[PDB]
Amino acid sequence: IVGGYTCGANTVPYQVSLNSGYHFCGGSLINSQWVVSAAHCYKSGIQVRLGEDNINVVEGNEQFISASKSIVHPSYNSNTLNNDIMLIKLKSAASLNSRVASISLPTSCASAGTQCLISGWGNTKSSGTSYPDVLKCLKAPILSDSSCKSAYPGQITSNMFCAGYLEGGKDSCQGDSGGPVVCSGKLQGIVSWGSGCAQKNKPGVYTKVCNYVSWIKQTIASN
Numbered sequence: 001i002v003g004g005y006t007c008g009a010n011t012v013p014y015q016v017s018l019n020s021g022y023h024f025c026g027g028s029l030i031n032s033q034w035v036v037s038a039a040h041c042y043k044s045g046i047q048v049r050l051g052e053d054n055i056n057v058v059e060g061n062e063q064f065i066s067a068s069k070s071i072v073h074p075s076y077n078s079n080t081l082n083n084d085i086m087l088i089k090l091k092s093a094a095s096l097n098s099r100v101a102s103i104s105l106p107t108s109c110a111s112a113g114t115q116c117l118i119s120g121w122g123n124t125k126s127s128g129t130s131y132p133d134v135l136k137c138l139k140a141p142i143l144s145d146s147s148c149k150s151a152y153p154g155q156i157t158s159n160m161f162c163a164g165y166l167e168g169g170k171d172s173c174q175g176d177s178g179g180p181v182v183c184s185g186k187l188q189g190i191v192s193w194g195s196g197c198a199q200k201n202k203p204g205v206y207t208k209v210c211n212y213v214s215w216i217k218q219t220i221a222s223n
């Protein structure tokens, strides 16, 4: 996160770290055995880490659970990043409490102007790499489709939305991929891509979760 602040230990209880010997993406806990992330974060050998704050130290509250299966959306296109969503089933259910909790799926899409919280252990510099130890947060508004599309002409599909600041300085970045964009207590986005990080007129692009609520439910129900 660039231009973000320290969230505070466990203040974001649905945030998970996807790890394979190092943190590479984020994800959101939606129920004791399922997490939602970005299809582009897929790999084998993923251990899901819950109750994390500082990713390099064990401080208590952490639950490390291996992933049983990752389900990349059947229509994910790695060249356009359209349908950039994946579901991971955990080997065992997580113990939920106030430090580890799931987040709710939306009943409706959100509108431009809605303020959302984005979190992650991704890069904090726009020019260079600086990865934090603790979880960073950023409050960002969903942008209008005309501003999104004027920013990335021909690259936005209807399963994407832009959120951020066109002046630059505050944005999500690499390492945050796969994680949550929560608005009014509902998971509305998944960190997906953008051009550089916190650059002027290049806001972040997120996977529009409201368009997959039925797919997520049908898939969890059949697995």
Ligand SMILES: NC(=[NH2+])c1ccc2[nH]c(-c3cccc(OC4CCCC4)c3[O-])cc2c1
Binding pocket: 024, 025, 040, 041, 171, 172, 173, 174, 175, 176, 177, 191, 192, 193, 194, 195, 196, 197, 198, 203, 204, 205
């Ligand atoms: N400007 C933004 N709001 C933004 C948001 C998410 C991003 N993710 C990335 C990104 C860049 C290089 C590699 C990535 O994923 C690989 C790391 C782990 C496995 C996949 C990214 O997600 C850039 C990037 C930029």
Ligand SMILES: [Ca+2]
Binding pocket: 052, 053, 054, 055, 056, 057, 058, 059, 062
């Ligand atoms: Ca830790």
